[PDB]
Design a protein around this nucleic acid. Sequence first.
DNA 1: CGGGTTTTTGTTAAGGGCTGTATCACTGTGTAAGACAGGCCAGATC
Length: 95
Amino acid sequence: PRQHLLSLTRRAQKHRLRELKIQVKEFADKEEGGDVKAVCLTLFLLALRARNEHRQADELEAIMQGRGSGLQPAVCLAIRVNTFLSCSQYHKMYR
DNA sequence: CGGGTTTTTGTTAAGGGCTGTATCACTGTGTAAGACAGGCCAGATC
């Protein structure tokens, strides 16, 4: 009995979308170079802007570009150094 | 109360990559004065 897509587990969702996975990967590496993740997030942003949710698309662009809700290692290194944090104290703080 | 049928859930093997944890040899905080026995000279003395 079918219930819903996101109600399944990871392996079950993979079993259910293996066909679309193969199709998208082949039709993306035929002509579009082969970057599967690129075509994936591009199609997702397009389907999301179809619902004109500018906010969600901007947040996803920020996440996938590293500029919000998550720091690149250089910035947190500068924070760990310029604030005189130790390696164990930063660890506790990060733990 | 089971077949027929369907959607979830493991299961093996080998390799890759990110995350967490044990291990090594060490540290910094326990830090100033007083009690007492022995020697010794200045001096009252009988």
